[PDB]
Amino acid sequence: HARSTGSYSLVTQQPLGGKAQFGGQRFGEMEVWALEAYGAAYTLQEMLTVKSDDVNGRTKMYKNIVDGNHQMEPGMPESFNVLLKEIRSLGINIELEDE
Amino acid sequence: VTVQDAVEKIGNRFDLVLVAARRARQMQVGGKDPLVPEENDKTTVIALREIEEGLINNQILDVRERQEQQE
Amino acid sequence: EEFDAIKIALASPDMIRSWSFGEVKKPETINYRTFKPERDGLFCARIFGPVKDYECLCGKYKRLKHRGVICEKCGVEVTQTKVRRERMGHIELASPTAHIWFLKSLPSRIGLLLDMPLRDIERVLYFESYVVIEGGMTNLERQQILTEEQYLDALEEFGDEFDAKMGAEAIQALLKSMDLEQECEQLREELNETNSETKRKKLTKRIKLLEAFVQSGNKPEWMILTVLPVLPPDLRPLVPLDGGRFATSDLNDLYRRVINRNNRLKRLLDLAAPDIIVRNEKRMLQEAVDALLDNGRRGRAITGSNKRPLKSLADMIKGKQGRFRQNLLGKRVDYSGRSVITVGPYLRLHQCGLPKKMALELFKPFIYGKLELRGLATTIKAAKKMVEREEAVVWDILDEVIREHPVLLNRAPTLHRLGIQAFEPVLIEGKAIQLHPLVCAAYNADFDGDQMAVHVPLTLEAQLEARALMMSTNNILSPANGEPIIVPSQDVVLGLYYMTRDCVNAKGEGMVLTGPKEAERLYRSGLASLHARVKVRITEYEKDANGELVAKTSLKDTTVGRAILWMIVPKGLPYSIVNQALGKKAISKMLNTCYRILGLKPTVIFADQIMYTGFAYAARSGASVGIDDMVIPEKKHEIISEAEAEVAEIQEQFQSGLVTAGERYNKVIDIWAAANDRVSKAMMDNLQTETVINRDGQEEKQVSFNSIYMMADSGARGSAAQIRQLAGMRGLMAKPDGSIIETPITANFREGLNVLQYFISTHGARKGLADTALKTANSGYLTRRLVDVAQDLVVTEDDCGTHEGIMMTPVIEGGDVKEPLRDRVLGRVTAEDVLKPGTADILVPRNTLLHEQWCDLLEENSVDAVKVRSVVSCDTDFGVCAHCYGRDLARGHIINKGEAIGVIAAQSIGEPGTQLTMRVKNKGSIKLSNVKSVVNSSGKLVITSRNTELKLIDEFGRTKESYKVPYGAVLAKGDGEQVAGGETVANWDPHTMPVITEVSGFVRFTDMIDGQTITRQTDELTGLSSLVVLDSAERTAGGKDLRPALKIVDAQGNDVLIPGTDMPAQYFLPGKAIVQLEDGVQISSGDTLARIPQTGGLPRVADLFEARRPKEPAILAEISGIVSFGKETKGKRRLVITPVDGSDPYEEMIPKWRQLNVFEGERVERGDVISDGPEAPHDILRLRGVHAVTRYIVNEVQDVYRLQGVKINDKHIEVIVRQMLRKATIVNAGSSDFLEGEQVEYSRVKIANRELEANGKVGATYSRDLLGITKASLATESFISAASFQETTRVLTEAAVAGKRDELRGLKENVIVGRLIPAGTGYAYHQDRMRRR
DNA sequence: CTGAATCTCTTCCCGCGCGCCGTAGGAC
DNA sequence: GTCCTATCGATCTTCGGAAGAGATTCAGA
RNA sequence: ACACAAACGGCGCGCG
Ligand SMILES: [Mg+2]
Ligand SMILES: [Zn+2]
Ligand SMILES: [Zn+2]
């Protein structure tokens, strides 16, 4: 099975899963540790932001590839927002700090 | 190609990649054509070759950009 | 956008309103007949946002141009639908409502504040018991709870001299009533008085909480919910599973219940329903909310008709299914694929083969760009349209695109960073992905069907990252140990092994060849056999003192195969290494040494040629295996028959009664053990010996060319055990209980088993599978714990500044060494200059990187131990210094700054853990330690010390041996005597504990009382009956009162003084000591008369890291003082240890059953074993921790793997230890606002003292604390990481009350938010980013 | 305020392939 | 038949396991 | 108007 591009789940913008649906491979949690073991970071950043969880970045990435730039914009993982909302949906007040 | 040698010139694995990427984007879309000859390689390798010679380096890159700004 | 920290807080009610964009009124969702969202309901458009694109439901507007207007007909703003997923709504609660977590956190936050137990306040909350307030006017109370009837009768007693309340209202009122700041100061005053520790700890918890609470921006009254937020609907989608028959959506369902529950209460409030009904309603409302949050923390979870518990809000966050594991720390990624694996011999090491089908898909965005760069595609859709063709031009472009693009391949589950590596692709017509054989071994790939996953790096930076680091050529060395992981395969090694072997006589043998060139030709023509013996001329190169390679030529006698193989060998390597049979052993070190001598670039190409050659001649060898190959020794039957006869004698002798059943049993198995071994001797010796050959006449013997022997002998596969089973006997076997069946499996496999024999074997086989199944599951959960705690550590400093360090020795156990000091000191840095052999001369600088030659130089000298700096000793702040870590296993040279070692260490340990299981002797000179001894009347030295050790020297002057010599044991060796094996060390009592008459004189019963303290035991048949001492814990009160002591006497009427001191020499006695050398008998110094009576892998390492106090720890001494008894044994026995200076009145409570290494007057020092048994690491830390406990822990874990022969580098363990004691405890006011008795993270206190003492102000006195990794991780300061680890709710609450702010230090935090982690590449950017600060 | 013998909500390798399968009660 | 409508919570096939630390809790000292 | 497409949650069986 192989997928270059495809739809994304509603509840979380991450790609669909499996073969029946044209889902993408899951980058396992342990494998991230392996990546972390090596000093590479840009790969990891691209891995989650561009390839998994940023509507804006991946779309812009899509164009850049057609533009031959092969450059990504940092973006921000969407699912993180989902978590923040849920936590904020609890009795907890949670915020992002600028300074 | 496989380098395992250019790292000696710059002296660090991480700096090698970081500096190389800085140069690579120049030849990618930034202009400033490759200094080393071309063998239908890709800019990542081409820039990698430039450091592999010790021809390009961070200090030269720092000089290259600042002097270019001019008018 | 720019941000740097996350903060946690409790939302004041207005804050919820601030988030709100509308009150959700109606408990309905959609117009079920035509599915509009329900206005004012759980999906109201105007509250949340438009359902479609940019337009409202009433269609007042239809373009972006209309941005920024409500539509009066249906309200909702004309805006992007995405806003629908973002904005939140609020609910108005009919009554104050309690948030459960704060109620039922294991330490009840509300309860602790109230100082009222969880169970009691629950009554008030649920409206089943009243709490009275303002009752000081009467017998009533500030906050006393009372029965409803108690309250109702109290109402008869008092009209309104009080107030009694129920539910959250009462709780919130009590919170509001708190003069919270004064309460803490009021409690602070109490602490000063508190005279008992159990009270103090309870108190300390409360004040700290209150101080934190007030200092935070939180206020307790907010905790009681009055307004409630509801998640944006899109985040709680209701998918039409089957059109109108939508899939269940629990959160909506819970909301539905609450809203309806709320409304119904509202109605009665409107109607002013009778009090009892509404009271119940209030609880039912609380119940629903309680369920909504947790749905299971309450007495009973609620469930639908499907009979499954509904998923509460917390569920989506907590645990394995939570967001952290489900989405954040691992996620599905586009441009990925999975394939089945295959081996491509033709591939070079850096290359990998993949199928065109996957490749065509994976690079579509790249293809489109090239097409439009080609201009062949007018537009993207046209490009996509052409790709559908799979036209030739597409393949041409695909080749151009893929021309050098690196790619990522990973097996699952990954063991370590070697588990993922980068490759350059080549295109394949089939569908499997082709892998280089040498690499796959590192991947642990077995081609029985293993799948593999592929990912493509997109950007310039990633491509360089992949090529620079991950590319296979870079990763020849293991990081767990700086050793080649590339050692060839079973087949590759065997073919070379066969090639390198020699034949005594062979075709073409005995010629002289100028060099390999003609050797290859001669073999190729078949005029000479591969392993035929031959004389050859050869040239080889030596690299000079600087490295310049110069040639020498010489003639050699060799076998032909060696010469041809030499052609593959590059220059600079001596021919001798290959002039021998090459098993995996020889190849392993040959390749390893080759790389170090020649470097990496020749090595990688050298490996490929080795791989190619091995396959080629393995095929030519025709190294097949057949049943005839398995020669069986005839002795098998003979020994079996011989052994059987003897076993029959043992059984008959047992029938005769001549032997017990156990002795009968164990003797039989010993007979079998000898029989099996003799079979192994015959079987193994024959197979290797099996070749007799003629050489120019006459015959000679040589190692056999048998297929089976070659496979095992080469080391390619199997072991001597396998062949012993197949050719010899399957041997002794045991039940699942581990008991050995009293008859072994005499049958081999070449001949079939009998039914029962085979049935017996099933027990063992399944057990092995069973263990593996659970082990693999258990080990993973261990690794997860490891990674979390370890992740934080990073090398950031060059030098920390310490001149201190730990000292390294070879493990000296089971007598002499069991490991070389050479291997351990390698790659480290000295702490002090090495003292040269002799004295005062220094051999190595104080901080030299102890690389190979110096280590060789050191071992060349007479060194026994050396002192080295360590990561634990590293003084770095928020990290580690490079010099403390020293060499990198995967690079040979010192580490590059900015690398997170912690993950490396965790993974290094993680992989090998899977391999665990879950189901005088020599020459030398003598030396003693912990020595105290006296000489007896027999002219030999006997030990008075209670912890004496024996150690021996090798007459080179280096010492490697150790043993424990029991207290009272007689030393056979003094003087540091020279000794040899069999000259046994000592006369000692391994059965029982002695008591020694250390002084010389007459042993008397002076103050030894007959009957009450020493009693004549009957002794049964002995005829003689012996006086025996009895213990305090067993004897009458007289035993306590008249406690006997063995006292000697001389002319004074009392024993001559304890040598040098006038104290009586009476030896205070325990029970069960038997005396028949009764009063008045002669005795000499050191004589004794008393004899008093005395697993697995993965779990052992597991609890060790968690540092659990053992089930029953050994009892150890503390303080340097003399011991004494008084608080007579009743439950615990009490002993006083009195240091003669300063702190005499120290005493402890001790269990009765433990044996004691001291009784009443022994002078003992800190940490001395009062009894043996497992030590609690914490106390080791407490006594002499940092260096000592490190060495203890390091040795303990190393033993597990050293048992398994797994070469884990110790330095990784030091990394774990760093975290284990990253915490510290303060007991001091110091000159900083740390609580007088406080627990802190070490770095924060360390730097605080740096500035505080630099100011001349009193630094606080602290001790460093031991936390189990699980406990340590949860205690970490960056709550986000801990929150993601486990027990989420207990963590969040901790942050909540604290209102903590996170600076997102470490990897996990950065990973979650997705910004560049401070790893090698990312660290440089992050380092510069702070430079902007 | 000491003592165990009592006490309950955490956790239980990583991924993959099919198959099935999801509120109750009623105008008669 | 189609379509409307209001709660949802008792008694039945339940028990099918168990390591580890904060309350609350058994015996006086 | 130059543009989306069919997964939410469980259970069983297998896989390395
Ligand atoms: Mg396999
Ligand atoms: Zn409208
Ligand atoms: Zn250091």
Curated annotation (Swiss-Prot), chain A:
Biotechnology and industry use: Co-administration of salinamide and rifampicin or salinamide and myxopyronin suppresses the emergence of resistance to both antibiotics.
Q: What is the superkingdom listed in this entry's lineage? A: Bacteria
Modified how: Acetylated on several lysine residues in the presence of glucose.
Can you list the disulfide-bonded cysteine pairs? none
Oligomer and partners = The RNAP catalytic core consists of 2 alpha, 1 beta, 1 beta' and 1 omega subunit. When a sigma factor is associated with the core the holoenzyme is formed, which can initiate transcription. The rRNA transcription and antitermination complex (rrnTAC) consists of RNAP, NusA, NusB, NusE (rpsJ), NusG, SubB, ribosomal protein S4, DNA and precursor rRNA; S4 is more flexible than other subunits. In pull-down experiments interacts with CedA. (Microbial infection) Interacts (via flap domain) with Escherichia phage lambda antitermination protein Q; this interaction renders bacterial RNAP resistant to transcription pausing and allows it to read through termination signals.
For this chain, the family text in UniProt reads: Belongs to the RNA polymerase beta chain family.
Question: Main role?
Answer: DNA-dependent RNA polymerase (RNAP) catalyzes the transcription of DNA into RNA using the four ribonucleoside triphosphates as substrates.
Report the protein name in the record: DNA-directed RNA polymerase subunit beta
Q: Which organism is it from?
A: Escherichia coli (strain K12)
Q: Where in the full protein does the shown chain start and end, and how long is the full protein?
A: 1244 to 1342 of 1342
UniProtKB/Swiss-Prot annotation, chain B:
What is stated as this protein's family in its record? Belongs to the RNA polymerase subunit omega family.
Tell me which stretches of the chain form a coiled coil.
Answer: none
User: What terms describe the molecular function in GO for this protein?
Assistant: bacterial-type RNA polymerase core enzyme binding; DNA binding; DNA-directed RNA polymerase activity
E.C. code: 2.7.7.6
- Keyword Transmembrane in annotation: no
The molecule here is called: DNA-directed RNA polymerase subunit omega
Q: Which reaction does it catalyse?
A: RNA(n) + a ribonucleoside 5'-triphosphate = RNA(n+1) + diphosphate
Q: Which UniProt keywords apply?
A: DNA-directed RNA polymerase, Nucleotidyltransferase, Transcription, Transferase
Signal peptide residues on this chain, from the entry's feature table: none
Main role? Promotes RNA polymerase (RNAP) assembly. Latches the N- and C-terminal regions of the beta' subunit thereby facilitating its interaction with the beta and alpha subunits.
Bilayer-crossing regions: none
According to the record's subunit comment, the protein's assembly and interactions are: The RNAP catalytic core consists of 2 alpha, 1 beta, 1 beta' and 1 omega subunit. When a sigma factor is associated with the core the holoenzyme is formed, which can initiate transcription. The rRNA transcription and antitermination complex (rrnTAC) consists of RNAP, NusA, NusB, NusE (rpsJ), NusG, SubB, ribosomal protein S4, DNA and precursor rRNA; S4 is more flexible than other subunits.
Question: Which Gene Ontology BP annotations are present?
Answer: bacterial-type flagellum assembly; bacterial-type flagellum-dependent cell motility; cell motility; cellular response to cell envelope stress; DNA-templated transcription initiation; intracellular iron ion homeostasis; nitrate assimilation; protein-containing complex assembly
Cellular compartments per GO CC = cytosol; cytosolic DNA-directed RNA polymerase complex; RNA polymerase complex; transcription elongation factor complex
Question: Has the keyword Transcription been applied to this entry?
Answer: yes
Curated annotation (Swiss-Prot), chain C:
- What's the top EC group for this one? transferase
Q: Which residues bind Zn(2+) 2?
A: C800, C874, C881, C884
**Impact of altering A721T?**
Resistant to antibiotics salinamide A and B
Indicate the impact reported for P744 to S/T.
Resistant to antibiotics salinamide A and B
Any single GO BP term: submerged biofilm formation
* Catalyzed reaction equations: RNA(n) + a ribonucleoside 5'-triphosphate = RNA(n+1) + diphosphate
Q: Which positions in this protein are listed as binding Mg(2+)? A: D446, D448, D450
Effect seen on changing L769R: Resistant to antibiotics salinamide A and B
Q: Name one Pfam family in it.
A: RNA_pol_Rpb1_4
Q: Which residues cross the membrane?
A: none
Tell me the keywords, alphabetical order. Answer: Acetylation, Antibiotic resistance, DNA-directed RNA polymerase, Magnesium, Metal-binding, Nucleotidyltransferase, Transcription, Transferase, Zinc
Identify the InterPro entries for this entry: DNA-dir_RpoC_beta_prime, DNA-dir_RpoC_beta_prime_bact, RNA_pol_asu, RNA_pol_N, RNA_pol_Rpb1_1, RNA_pol_Rpb1_3, RNA_pol_Rpb1_3_sf, RNA_pol_Rpb1_4
The record's comment on protein family reads: Belongs to the RNA polymerase beta' chain family.
Protein role: DNA-dependent RNA polymerase (RNAP) catalyzes the transcription of DNA into RNA using the four ribonucleoside triphosphates as substrates.
What name appears for this protein in its UniProt entry? Answer: DNA-directed RNA polymerase subunit beta'
